[PDB]
Symmetry: C3
Subunit: 138 residues, 3 copies
């Protein structure tokens, strides 16, 4: 039996702070916060049944880029279904790898986009998803 020490791991709040901006977003860098928040707030009021989503390629990803970054997604569509739709947009074959990341974690396919947004949207009222052929963002 070990009196050897435990590795004392951080909790959710410390994780969230440690990795807050660890996923890059050219969208966040090219548009000032107040303008994003304004547009995000307005689109949620105009279409309450949909959520605004920014989808961008991870820097290390070896995979085609997306023609469009800004997605307005019905809240009852699951993550798995949105993934299937984005796969078609990249023109990936079914055997090809594709992974989604929200705050450095792959969300389960059964989550609705409405739940994902409600749980993880940023203060500008957008949800940020990065994608990669790798099973980790970085």
């Amino acid at each position: 039996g070990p009196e050897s020490p435990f590795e004392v791991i951080i909790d959710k709040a410390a994780f969230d702070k440690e990795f807050k901006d660890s996923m890059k977003s050219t969208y966040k860098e090219e548009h000032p916060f107040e303008k994003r928040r304004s547009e995000g707030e307005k689109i949620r009021k105009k279409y309450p049944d949909r959520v605004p989503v920014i989808v961008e390629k991870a820097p290390k990803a070896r995979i085609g880029d997306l023609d469009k970054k800004k997605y307005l997604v019905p809240s009852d569509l699951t993550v798995g279904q949105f993934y299937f739709l984005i796969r078609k947009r990249i023109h990936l074959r079914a055997e090809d790898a594709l992974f989604f990341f929200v705050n450095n974690v792959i969300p389960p396919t059964s989550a609705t986009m409405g739940q994902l947004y409600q749980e993880h949207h940023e203060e500008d009222f957008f949800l940020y998803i990065a994608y990669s052929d790798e099973s980790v963002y970085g």
Copy 2:
């Protein structure tokens, strides 16, 4: 200038319609809809604990075929545990990939078979699970 347009993505009902015919079943093609509705009802009324599931190889799949298509499964068992067992029955190698699909999406390992049935059963009271070496059905 004006705000960049969003890509307006389809919702769940439109997803379900656009990809309903995506998944083919030899068991559904060799067994009429009325016979399967009666059979699925009879087992489902006789066996409320267990759920009836058809497990079949995706057409483009490169996996070994199963000896048995029809399964009556204790609905408390999780899909992950069912998956473990089905892997055992294919005598699949640990280095080989295997995925389950319902309506072109992989179900979560923590779901009981009852939740998957009551959420995705067809009009014949049958749950349809496809398996493949591919991370997507098509």
Copy 3:
């Protein structure tokens, strides 16, 4: 027999619940682990003790450290991300976690995983591999 009827929890757990190898279990006797598990849970009720070890067949680095004291509100996905960094895996490397031979969903909290699956020594055991099934 047209329908195939599959075996249940009693045989499942009797057959598999101790089936993943643990060098920790082999090197520390059950009585001392149970004592340490009980004590650490009463001392830090907001955390859960976790042993993380390589599956026998895995082609993957070993961990410098096995014993983790994990806040119960951290999700499995978050803990996975942290363990990946400790193994110093490259982004292109695959990594899978197994609890009782099943991959847990990333959204489960470590507190729930522990509650559902800890053993009688009051530790939760996770095995990892580059393969998508324990081996």
